[PDB]
Design an enzyme around this catalytic site. Structure first.
Site, PDB file in Angstrom:
ATOM      1  CG  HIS A 246      -0.483   0.392   2.513  1.00  6.35           C
ATOM      2  ND1 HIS A 246       0.670  -0.145   3.048  1.00  6.35           N
ATOM      3  CD2 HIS A 246      -0.990   1.214   3.471  1.00  6.35           C
ATOM      4  CE1 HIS A 246       0.861   0.349   4.267  1.00  6.35           C
ATOM      5  NE2 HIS A 246      -0.137   1.168   4.548  1.00  6.35           N
TER       6      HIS A 246
ATOM      7  CG  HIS B 196       0.086   4.663   4.747  1.00  7.07           C
ATOM      8  ND1 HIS B 196      -0.768   4.036   5.621  1.00  7.07           N
ATOM      9  CD2 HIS B 196      -0.566   5.763   4.296  1.00  7.07           C
ATOM     10  CE1 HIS B 196      -1.896   4.719   5.687  1.00  7.07           C
ATOM     11  NE2 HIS B 196      -1.794   5.777   4.905  1.00  7.07           N
TER      12      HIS B 196
ATOM     13  CG  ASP C 239       3.913   1.527   7.136  1.00  8.12           C
ATOM     14  OD1 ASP C 239       3.306   1.916   6.123  1.00  8.12           O
ATOM     15  OD2 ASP C 239       3.320   1.045   8.143  1.00  8.12           O
TER      16      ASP C 239
ATOM     17  CG  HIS D 212      -4.132   0.284   6.874  1.00 12.55           C
ATOM     18  ND1 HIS D 212      -4.104   1.130   7.970  1.00 12.55           N
ATOM     19  CD2 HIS D 212      -2.979   0.495   6.200  1.00 12.55           C
ATOM     20  CE1 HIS D 212      -2.974   1.810   7.956  1.00 12.55           C
ATOM     21  NE2 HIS D 212      -2.257   1.418   6.910  1.00 12.55           N
TER      22      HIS D 212
ATOM     23  CB  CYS E 155      -0.907  -1.482   7.373  1.00 13.65           C
ATOM     24  SG  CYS E 155       0.817  -1.004   7.395  1.00 13.65           S
TER      25      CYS E 155
ATOM     26  CE  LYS F 185      -2.473  -1.851  11.399  1.00  9.14           C
ATOM     27  NZ  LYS F 185      -3.074  -0.846  10.556  1.00  9.14           N
TER      28      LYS F 185
ATOM     29  CG  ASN G 107      -3.195   6.539  10.678  1.00  8.09           C
ATOM     30  OD1 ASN G 107      -4.006   7.382  11.075  1.00  8.09           O
ATOM     31  ND2 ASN G 107      -2.629   6.590   9.466  1.00  8.09           N
TER      32      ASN G 107
ATOM     33  CG  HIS H 245       2.410  -1.871  12.047  1.00  7.18           C
ATOM     34  ND1 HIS H 245       3.608  -1.245  11.756  1.00  7.18           N
ATOM     35  CD2 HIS H 245       1.508  -1.395  11.147  1.00  7.18           C
ATOM     36  CE1 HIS H 245       3.429  -0.408  10.743  1.00  7.18           C
ATOM     37  NE2 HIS H 245       2.162  -0.475  10.360  1.00  7.18           N
TER      38      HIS H 245
HETATM   39  N1  LIG Z   1       3.775   3.282  10.269  1.00 10.29           N
HETATM   40  C1  LIG Z   1       2.555   3.056  10.977  1.00 10.29           C
HETATM   41  N2  LIG Z   1       1.502   2.415  10.516  1.00 10.29           N
HETATM   42  C2  LIG Z   1       0.450   2.352  11.355  1.00 10.29           C
HETATM   43  C3  LIG Z   1      -0.781   1.586  10.920  1.00 10.29           C
HETATM   44  O1  LIG Z   1      -1.865   1.693  11.547  1.00 10.29           O
HETATM   45  O2  LIG Z   1      -0.682   0.807   9.936  1.00 10.29           O
HETATM   46  C4  LIG Z   1       0.649   2.985  12.606  1.00 10.29           C
HETATM   47  C5  LIG Z   1      -0.246   3.109  13.828  1.00 10.29           C
HETATM   48  C6  LIG Z   1       0.368   2.339  15.017  1.00 10.29           C
HETATM   49  C7  LIG Z   1      -0.376   1.031  15.270  1.00 10.29           C
HETATM   50  C8  LIG Z   1      -0.049  -0.097  14.541  1.00 10.29           C
HETATM   51  C9  LIG Z   1      -0.750  -1.301  14.740  1.00 10.29           C
HETATM   52  C10 LIG Z   1      -1.774  -1.376  15.663  1.00 10.29           C
HETATM   53  C11 LIG Z   1      -2.095  -0.239  16.399  1.00 10.29           C
HETATM   54  C12 LIG Z   1      -1.404   0.959  16.196  1.00 10.29           C
HETATM   55  S1  LIG Z   1       2.205   3.627  12.526  1.00 10.29           S
HETATM   56 ZN   LIG Z   2      -0.560   2.159   6.310  1.00 12.52          ZN
HETATM   57 ZN   LIG Z   3       1.353   0.777   8.948  1.00 13.43          ZN
END
Ligand SMILES: Nc1nc(C(=O)O)c(CCc2ccccc2)s1
Ligand SMILES: [Zn+2]
Ligand SMILES: [Zn+2]
Length: 219
Positions: A75, A77, A79, A137, A156, A159, A165, A195
């Site tokens: 995606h 973003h 990251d 996401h 991402c 989750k 985010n 993450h």
């Molecule tokens: N580079 C970043 N991506 C994200 C995202 O949501 O993909 C961030 C938010 C931090 C987070 C990550 C996972 C679960 C809960 C919170 S920061």
């Molecule tokens: Zn993202």
């Molecule tokens: Zn992310």
């Protein structure tokens, strides 16, 4: 300050790369991507946040004999895409969906040099598949499937304990997208979120629950 880029074998010919950023409000955020070895060639599944970490990642494998044949960003973003600019600059082919490149363009970011469209796309036929489950996401989020070891990279979109985010999320669509992902990939042996730690197929169920809950909370 942050921990260093980590590279760790996940399975045969499959490595997890983890890079780190400190995000205001969330603390230290790990970001997982993959490197997938096919014969003597390596493919990056998402880039680290930075050019510096992408250069480290590439050279780790080059120094081990692998040629870097391309990268796919799951995606738009940073990251997932932070390393595209450096990879382009090394004439390493970069891939993203058409939708992801349009989002990069609109975000004022450099785009991948190769784009694809559609629900299924073979980055490498019968070895590295890309699947679009629908928005969640982000509108463009795709996942990457490795048939031999049954490894799903969920980016991402996976989750399992909270959605993260929501700035660019579509929480109305996310439960349908996640239900779709769960049905298609329930036989996954390993699911790799962006993450959170690697788990098994139950991470698909947990993601669906977090999506439904997030939809309900927003009312
Ligand atoms: N580079 C970043 N991506 C994200 C995202 O949501 O993909 C961030 C938010 C931090 C987070 C990550 C996972 C679960 C809960 C919170 S920061
Ligand atoms: Zn993202
Ligand atoms: Zn992310």
């Amino acid at each position: 300050s942050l921990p260093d880029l980590k590279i760790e074998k996940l399975d045969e010919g499959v490595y997890v790369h983890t890079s780190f950023e400190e995000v205001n409000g969330w603390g230290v955020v790990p970001k997982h991507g993959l490197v997938v070895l096919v014969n003597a060639e390596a493919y990056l599944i998402d880039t680290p946040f930075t050019a510096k970490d992408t250069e480290k990642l590439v050279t780790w494998f080059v120094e081990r004999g692998y040629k870097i044949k391309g990268s796919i960003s799951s995606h738009f973003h940073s990251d997932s895409t932070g390393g595209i600019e450096w990879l382009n600059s090394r004439s390493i082919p970069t891939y993203a969906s058409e939708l992801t490149n349009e989002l990069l363009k609109k975000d004022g970011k450099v785009q991948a040099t190769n784009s694809f469209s559609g629900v299924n796309y073979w980055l490498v036929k019968n070895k590295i598949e890309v699947f679009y489950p629908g928005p969640g996401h982000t509108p463009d989020n795709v996942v990457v499937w490795l048939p031999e070891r049954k490894i799903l990279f969920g980016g991402c979109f996976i989750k399992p304990y909270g959605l993260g985010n929501l700035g660019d999320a579509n929480i109305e669509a996310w439960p349908k997208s996640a239900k779709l992902l769960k049905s298609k990939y329930g036989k996954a042996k390993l699911v790799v979120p962006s993450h959170s730690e690697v788990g098994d197929a139950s991470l698909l169920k947990l993601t669906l629950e977090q999506a439904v809950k997030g939809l309900n909370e927003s009312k």
